[PDB]
């Protein structure tokens, strides 16, 4: 295990998220069900090739790392919420997670380093 991984991510928030607003929407109104549908819709478009992970994240991620095309930079263990940390460290570089759940909402993660 490396000390640190670098990942990008795409966050979809929902109305029950820890903090239900984002840079792109003043109040998050979508239900958790709609959030997971969006996430799965993204996974299937990135898989077929119709959409690009980092373009989607710059447009639609509810995390302000959208401005950096999803890039969170490098992080060690003990910094990120545990489910996000665990999914990140289990990816190979270039590999994308399935849906990942944290208090902030639902994520997909791309390990870059
Ligand atoms: O806008 C916020 O409240 C923070 C968004 C957020 N929450 C995260 C949790 C884990 C990793 C990245 C994350 N980005």
UniProtKB/Swiss-Prot annotation:
Gene from which this protein is expressed: PIN1
GO biological process terms on file: cellular response to hypoxia; negative regulation of amyloid-beta formation; negative regulation of cell motility; negative regulation of ERK1 and ERK2 cascade; negative regulation of protein binding; negative regulation of protein catabolic process; negative regulation of SMAD protein signal transduction; negative regulation of transforming growth factor beta receptor signaling pathway
Species per Swiss-Prot/TrEMBL record: Homo sapiens
Domain notes: The WW domain is required for the interaction with STIL and KIF20B.
Keywords assigned: Acetylation, Cell cycle, Cytoplasm, Isomerase, Nucleus, Phosphoprotein, Rotamase
Cytoplasm among keywords: yes
PpiC domain: residues covered: 2-113
Catalytic activity: [protein]-peptidylproline (omega=180) = [protein]-peptidylproline (omega=0)
Protein name: Peptidyl-prolyl cis-trans isomerase NIMA-interacting 1
PTM comment, free text: Phosphorylation at Ser-21 by DAPK1 results in inhibition of its catalytic activity, nuclear localization, and its ability to induce centrosome amplification, chromosome instability and cell transformation. Ser-21 is dephosphorylated upon IL33-stimulation of dendritic cells.
EC number: 5.2.1.8
Subunit note: Interacts with STIL. Interacts with KIF20B. Interacts with NEK6. Interacts (via WW domain) with PRKX. Interacts with BTK. Interacts (via PpiC domain) with DAPK1. Interacts with the phosphorylated form of RAF1. Interacts (via WW domain) with ATCAY; upon NGF stimulation. Interacts with PML (isoform PML-4). Interacts with BCL6. Interacts with FBXW7, disrupting FBXW7 dimerization and promoting FBXW7 autoubiquitination and degradation. Directly interacts with RBBP8/CtIP; this interaction depends upon RBBP8 phosphorylation.
Main subcellular location: nucleus
GO molecular function, one term: phosphothreonine residue binding
Covered residues, full protein: 51 to 163 of 163
Annotated function: Peptidyl-prolyl cis/trans isomerase (PPIase) that binds to and isomerizes specific phosphorylated Ser/Thr-Pro (pSer/Thr-Pro) motifs. By inducing conformational changes in a subset of phosphorylated proteins, acts as a molecular switch in multiple cellular processes. Displays a preference for acidic residues located N-terminally to the proline bond to be isomerized. Regulates mitosis presumably by interacting with NIMA and attenuating its mitosis-promoting activity. Down-regulates kinase activity of BTK.
Cellular localisation: Nucleus; Nucleus speckle; Cytoplasm
GO cellular component: ciliary basal body; cytoplasm; cytosol; glutamatergic synapse; midbody; nuclear speck; nucleoplasm; nucleus
Free-text tissue specificity from the UniProt record: Expressed in immune cells in the lung (at protein level). The phosphorylated form at Ser-21 is expressed in normal breast tissue cells but not in breast cancer cells.
Phosphoserine PTM sites in chain numbering: 21, 58
Record's keyword annotation contains Acetylation: yes
């Amino acid at each position: 295990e490396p000390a640190r991984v670098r990942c990008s991510h795409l966050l979809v928030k929902h109305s029950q998220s820890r903090r239900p607003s984002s840079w792109r929407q003043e109040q998050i109104t979508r239900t958790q069900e709609e959030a997971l549908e969006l996430i799965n819709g993204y996974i299937q478009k990135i898989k077929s090739g119709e959409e690009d992970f980092e373009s989607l994240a710059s447009q639609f991620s509810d995390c302000s790392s959208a401005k950096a095309r999803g890039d969170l930079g490098a992080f060690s263990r003990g910094q990120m919420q545990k489910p996000f940390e665990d999914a990140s460290f289990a990816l190979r570089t270039g590999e994308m997670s399935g849906p990942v759940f944290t208090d902030s909402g639902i994520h997909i993660i791309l390990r870059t380093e």
